[PDB]
Design a binder for these strands. Structure first.
Lengths: 59, 59
DNA sequence: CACTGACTCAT
DNA sequence: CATGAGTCAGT
């Protein structure tokens, strides 16, 4: 029982460690994409104040 | 030093759990913002395949 | 000396 | 079976 719990803790922690690694990457990827879409919208609509419409969020 | 480490453990787990929650929130915040940007560009430049220029990030 | 990985216990 | 917390060992 002790052995099996030792296996489950390792798994939980990695689930956890990989889960943290995953959301750290996605947060960055989504943030960079957000920057790309804001620039593309600006290129197509040079007269539109994007930052005023869809305010930026911190990171 | 059992008291000190007990405290540091809780702290390390709060950071880790906090860090994870933080990135998750940033990722979710950016995603919703990006969806609003993609819609704005569609309704501003209807005849433009944005997905072929900047595909959606696999959440 | 504080931070963190990993084992154990109790949920 | 998964996880929050105390503990020990290593960073």
């Amino acid at each position: 029982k002790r052995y099996k719990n030792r296996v489950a803790s390792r798994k939980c922690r990695a689930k956890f460690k990989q889960l943290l690694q995953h959301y750290r990457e996605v947060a960055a990827a989504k943030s960079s994409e957000n920057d790309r879409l804001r620039l593309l919208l600006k290129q197509m609509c040079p007269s539109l104040d994007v930052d005023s419409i869809i305010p930026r969020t911190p990171d």
